[PDB]
Amino acid sequence: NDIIVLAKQMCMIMMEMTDFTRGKGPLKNTSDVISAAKKIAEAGSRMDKLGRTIADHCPDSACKQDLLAYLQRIALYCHQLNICSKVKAEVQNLGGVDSAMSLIQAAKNLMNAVVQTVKASYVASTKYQKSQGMASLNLPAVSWKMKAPEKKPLVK
Amino acid sequence: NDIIVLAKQMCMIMMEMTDFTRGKGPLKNTSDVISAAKKIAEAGSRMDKLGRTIADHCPDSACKQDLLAYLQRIALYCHQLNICSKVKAEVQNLGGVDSAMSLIQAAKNLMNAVVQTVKASYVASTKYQKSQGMASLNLPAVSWKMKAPEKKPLVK
Amino acid sequence: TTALVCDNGSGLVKAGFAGDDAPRAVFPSIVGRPRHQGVMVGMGQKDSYVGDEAQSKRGILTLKYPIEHGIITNWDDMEKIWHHTFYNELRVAPEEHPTLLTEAPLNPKANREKMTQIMFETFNVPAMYVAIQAVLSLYASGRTTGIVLDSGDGVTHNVPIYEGYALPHAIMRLDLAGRDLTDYLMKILTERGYSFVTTAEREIVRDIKEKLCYVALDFENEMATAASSSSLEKSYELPDGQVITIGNERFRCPETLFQPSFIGMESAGIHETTYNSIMKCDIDIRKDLYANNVMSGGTTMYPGIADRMQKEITALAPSTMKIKIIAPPERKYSVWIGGSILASLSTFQQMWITKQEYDEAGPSIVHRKC
Ligand SMILES: Nc1ncnc2c1ncn2[C@@H]1O[C@H](COP(=O)(O)OP(=O)(O)O)[C@@H](O)[C@H]1O
Ligand SMILES: [Mg+2]
């Protein structure tokens, strides 16, 4: 599944960003964070087309409404990261973990929106599989690696 | 007789359960009771097939009606014990003689239904011995260890 | 091929698969809608949140419960709740699993009929069934005899069952449950100067009630103790760091179950209702009903409610009687556990309402099959 692998490699990037936040990870300082923000935004735009296609192959008054909501969130988060990374690149070039916090917060927001988009896409594809167009996408509820939900604790 | 020995070994289990109820027996606490409930339910399912066969080899408007009634009671009780034991197992794993009471009550109910099924099976086999099919079962009213009923007290 | 079990309570949805021993989805049965001004582009496209989605964002939402008192009042929000349950929480396709649903007794028939219709026509379930929650509680308790006192967010009901036979004339329903206690606690928290008005603040007060409230074994000595000392006062930290202290609101709020006149109701307490239900039963089954007082539901989860329950019923019943209150540790999910016991039963598989039967007989099939 293209959606799953794209979102999950972005999750790898977003893990490396939190690891820099904890102060011990594969990124030395702000410049690595700026580069990571740029690539996570690019992968978010790719995710944006994947969501666009799954939405376009869906009936109107269907799960496509939530999916388009999450896609619009994705678009704002990716755009904020690209301009903010350009801003902080310029600031570094002229003159900062505090600076890294804005990019990391935007990345957290984007990753949360991407998780929401992933589950929305899965529901849209499963619910309307043998509707025409979705078959061409060939997303048969198995390419999605959906675990069974784990049982609740009876006593808390 | 398979029916008699199965029911009577289940009676041994159900005795050990009451002995835990009295607080002095071969079971230390709830975990032993859960295990005993699981095995008594398994033996009840075995009893369920034994009753099924004796019923299937019986005429329609015969003692098979009562026997099927008691078999359905057996099915309900055995299923309740298996889920209740699983629920009690999860509760113990997360966090109880009061807990043992539900399993012991279900076990009492199951054992009573099994006694009813035993006598119903005996009546069905004796009443319709040289009907075809019952002979193949080879249950000639002697494999059943039926005592003579004891006399009533003339003065009370 | 595996049945679903959705326990639609007034407060929480308990959903899962038949055969399992615990629900896999337990989320609030609320739908939230934004009530403020969306000022960022794309951040206001989602117009409705369901379940934990709404409790997470409840600071900008208006939370609504589709079910009051066990009757579904909003059929478009409940429909959203069910869509969430099936697709986002359980992640199944409803048209392959039979669904077991639960309902309180003495409830409008249109409720059950419209549940049947929504299942069979919006979710295309192959079969469905509507079961009474107290019978399911008795299933989960491993008994076939006993009187069940089930209290949830919306309704408290008493169903006496003996040897698997219900006595429907002795069933008692009382529209006083967790949400009424939450409202009463919001009301009496104002005596200390704490004002919780919004629906989100109602969720905060529900949390306060779940964490701090308990049932006093003897109400008057507890009031005297709270007046004399400050030993019963406990603190609670609000979501923004303010700390509140409540002394006798802790046992005054649950006392409304035993003194419904606290909230202006004329009915009898749950002990009196239980006794009155036992005394509408045949005299020969009363002894076994006294000894099996199954309590299920989350409103029966107060510390000390079983002790007070037994004390009151012992006062009411004869002195030679055998009063036992059965309160399992997991009784917050007894209805779901019993529903999964029933839906997995081998003898139950001819008791589903198949879609063929629905197509023959309309939604009215549910009153005669269930
Ligand atoms: N520990 C607790 N103490 C007191 N009340 C509780 C506790 N946990 C849950 N509740 C109350 O129980 C209600 C939910 O119980 P539940 O049986 O799930 O209701 P329903 O059947 O309506 O979904 C809520 O109103 C909540 O206020
Ligand atoms: Mg309930």
Side-chain angles (χ1 to χ4, degrees):
Chain A
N1 203 329
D2 205 334
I3 297 89
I4 301 282
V5 299
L6 179 48
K8 234 193 39 205
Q9 65 183 357
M10 273 178 352
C11 185
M12 298 293 129
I13 313 171
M14 187 13 233
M15 269 301 149
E16 87 178 1
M17 261 203 202
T18 60
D19 285 2
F20 172 81
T21 288
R22 313 192 267 129
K24 168 175 181 198
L27 303 95
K28 58 96 174 179
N29 75 11
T30 67
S31 276
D32 283 359
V33 184
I34 298 170
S35 336
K38 294 214 201 70
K39 21 149 178 275
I40 199 181
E42 291 176 341
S45 277
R46 276 180 263 144
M47 187 72 177
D48 196 286
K49 297 191 157 48
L50 278 70
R52 294 291 137 188
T53 301
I54 304 196
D56 284 347
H57 289 193
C58 189
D60 188 3
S61 284
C63 303
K64 77 174 288 184
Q65 191 173 359
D66 286 337
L67 188 135
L68 295 161
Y70 299 130
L71 286 174
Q72 283 198 6
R73 291 181 190 174
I74 282 187
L76 168 61
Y77 295 144
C78 297
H79 198 76
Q80 264 173 316
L81 273 157
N82 288 307
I83 320 250
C84 287
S85 66
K86 217 178 14 241
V87 158
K88 292 182 179 349
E90 184 181 4
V91 169
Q92 288 286 103
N93 292 15
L94 285 169
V97 187
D98 299 328
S99 74
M101 222 59 165
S102 78
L103 292 165
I104 294 156
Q105 183 63 256
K108 293 163 83 138
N109 286 266
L110 177 52
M111 217 29 271
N112 195 355
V114 174
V115 179
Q116 279 326 108
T117 313
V118 167
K119 238 139 64 59
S121 304
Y122 165 80
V123 175
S125 1
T126 293
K127 181 173 175 70
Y128 299 100
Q129 176 77 350
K130 82 184 59 218
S131 188
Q132 86 274 5
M134 293 296 203
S136 83
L137 296 209
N138 215 349
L139 276 177
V142 187
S143 64
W144 313 97
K145 276 73 69 177
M146 292 292 196
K147 278 73 69 178
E150 57 260 17
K151 285 188 223 149
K152 290 310 187 210
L154 285 172
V155 297
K156 206 88 157 175
Chain B
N1 203 329
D2 205 334
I3 297 89
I4 301 282
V5 299
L6 179 48
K8 234 193 39 205
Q9 65 183 357
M10 273 178 352
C11 185
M12 298 293 129
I13 313 171
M14 187 13 233
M15 269 301 150
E16 87 178 1
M17 261 203 202
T18 60
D19 285 2
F20 172 81
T21 288
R22 313 192 267 129
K24 168 175 181 198
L27 303 95
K28 58 96 174 179
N29 75 11
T30 67
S31 276
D32 283 359
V33 184
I34 298 170
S35 336
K38 294 214 201 70
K39 21 149 178 275
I40 199 181
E42 290 176 341
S45 277
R46 276 180 263 144
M47 187 72 177
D48 196 286
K49 296 191 157 48
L50 278 71
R52 294 291 137 188
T53 301
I54 304 196
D56 284 347
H57 289 193
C58 189
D60 188 3
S61 284
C63 303
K64 77 174 288 184
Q65 191 173 359
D66 286 338
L67 188 135
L68 295 161
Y70 299 130
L71 286 174
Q72 283 198 6
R73 291 181 191 174
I74 286 180
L76 166 61
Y77 297 144
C78 290
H79 189 75
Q80 261 179 321
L81 271 154
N82 289 305
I83 319 238
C84 289
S85 65
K86 210 187 3 234
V87 158
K88 246 54 93 228
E90 185 181 4
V91 169
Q92 288 286 103
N93 292 15
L94 285 169
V97 187
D98 299 328
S99 74
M101 222 59 165
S102 78
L103 292 165
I104 294 156
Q105 183 63 256
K108 293 163 83 138
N109 286 266
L110 177 52
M111 217 29 271
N112 195 356
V114 174
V115 179
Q116 279 326 108
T117 313
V118 167
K119 237 139 64 59
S121 304
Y122 165 80
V123 175
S125 1
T126 293
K127 181 173 175 71
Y128 298 100
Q129 176 77 350
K130 82 184 59 218
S131 188
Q132 86 274 5
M134 293 295 203
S136 83
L137 296 209
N138 215 349
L139 276 177
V142 187
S143 64
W144 313 97
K145 276 73 69 177
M146 292 292 196
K147 278 73 69 178
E150 57 260 17
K151 285 188 223 149
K152 290 310 187 210
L154 285 172
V155 297
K156 206 88 157 175
Chain C
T1 179
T2 178
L4 291 174
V5 179
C6 192
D7 183 26
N8 289 122
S10 299
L12 293 151
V13 190
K14 278 74 69 178
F17 301 98
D20 296 15
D21 67 352
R24 302 181 173 233
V26 178
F27 56 100
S29 170
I30 62 183
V31 179
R33 289 187 177 80
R35 73 189 196 80
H36 286 134
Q37 189 175 18
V39 292
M40 292 188 181
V41 182
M43 292 301 335
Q45 284 291 103
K46 193 155 160 49
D47 63 286
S48 174
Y49 307 79
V50 181
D52 294 303
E53 202 75 15
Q55 289 262 6
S56 270
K57 291 180 138 109
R58 70 178 183 216
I60 53 170
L61 308 185
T62 293
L63 307 184
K64 301 265 168 260
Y65 284 84
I67 297 173
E68 275 56 2
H69 292 307
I71 307 141
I72 301 159
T73 68
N74 204 331
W75 278 101
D76 284 66
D77 279 44
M78 195 61 246
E79 242 249 338
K80 290 183 159 64
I81 296 277
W82 274 325
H83 180 279
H84 189 77
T85 294
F86 288 137
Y87 292 97
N88 295 66
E89 293 290 288
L90 287 187
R91 289 173 280 156
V92 298
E95 62 272 17
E96 339 161 11
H97 313 277
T99 307
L100 185 71
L101 305 159
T102 75
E103 187 183 4
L106 305 173
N107 198 0
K109 287 181 135 200
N111 208 62
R112 187 178 272 212
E113 271 166 48
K114 285 191 61 59
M115 292 181 4
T116 304
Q117 180 179 0
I118 299 295
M119 287 302 116
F120 277 133
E121 297 185 359
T122 306
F123 300 110
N124 305 271
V125 296
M128 61 81 71
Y129 194 79
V130 188
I132 299 298
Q133 312 174 329
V135 189
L136 301 191
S137 288
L138 208 59
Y139 271 118
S141 79
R143 296 163 158 82
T144 55
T145 290
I147 181 167
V148 190
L149 169 76
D150 178 85
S151 201
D153 201 30
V155 39
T156 297
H157 53 263
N158 264 294
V159 176
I161 291 152
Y162 183 80
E163 300 290 318
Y165 287 95
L167 287 87
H169 62 276
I171 292 175
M172 293 184 183
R173 164 166 171 151
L174 161 67
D175 282 359
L176 164 59
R179 213 172 305 169
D180 308 64
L181 304 187
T182 298
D183 291 349
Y184 186 53
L185 185 68
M186 290 192 289
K187 181 209 155 286
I188 74 184
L189 277 183
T190 54
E191 313 180 341
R192 300 218 171 208
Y194 311 130
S195 170
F196 304 101
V197 287
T198 302
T199 49
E201 308 193 292
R202 179 176 296 159
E203 297 303 296
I204 294 170
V205 175
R206 180 193 43 78
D207 198 35
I208 299 175
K209 167 195 73 148
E210 296 174 1
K211 276 179 194 174
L212 290 183
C213 287
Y214 68 98
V215 171
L217 182 70
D218 191 52
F219 183 60
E220 297 298 334
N221 303 46
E222 276 268 7
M223 291 292 288
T225 299
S228 80
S229 178
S230 78
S231 53
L232 292 142
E233 294 196 27
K234 293 207 164 319
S235 293
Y236 182 95
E237 184 179 357
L238 296 188
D240 67 330
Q242 292 147 298
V243 175
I244 66 169
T245 314
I246 64 166
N248 58 15
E249 290 91 343
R250 305 185 50 217
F251 55 94
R252 271 211 284 153
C253 166
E255 189 71 19
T256 318
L257 293 166
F258 304 88
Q259 275 156 268
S261 72
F262 279 17
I263 58 157
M265 294 189 40
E266 206 196 28
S267 66
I270 50 179
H271 62 295
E272 253 163 13
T273 299
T274 305
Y275 178 70
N276 293 343
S277 181
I278 287 168
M279 297 293 254
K280 290 178 172 68
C281 300
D282 292 335
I283 182 166
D284 307 279
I285 76 169
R286 272 172 215 166
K287 183 181 183 125
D288 307 77
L289 290 197
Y290 281 130
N292 310 273
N293 277 104
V294 186
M295 292 182 53
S296 53
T299 291
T300 69
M301 293 286 298
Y302 289 103
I305 191 158
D307 295 308
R308 171 84 172 269
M309 218 25 231
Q310 182 180 66
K311 155 178 198 196
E312 308 274 34
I313 300 192
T314 310
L316 288 166
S319 39
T320 85
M321 284 299 106
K322 201 351 196 124
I323 312 300
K324 186 176 200 52
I325 308 291
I326 294 147
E330 81 281 346
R331 63 197 180 276
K332 211 192 300 190
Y333 308 103
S334 284
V335 172
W336 191 94
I337 290 162
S340 82
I341 292 184
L342 173 74
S344 313
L345 204 48
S346 44
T347 39
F348 179 69
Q349 300 313 329
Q350 317 303 320
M351 293 181 144
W352 296 99
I353 299 163
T354 56
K355 189 165 170 53
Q356 273 293 105
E357 299 169 71
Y358 175 77
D359 287 334
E360 274 117 7
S364 66
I365 189 72
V366 74
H367 307 311
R368 69 183 91 160
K369 285 303 287 290
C370 309

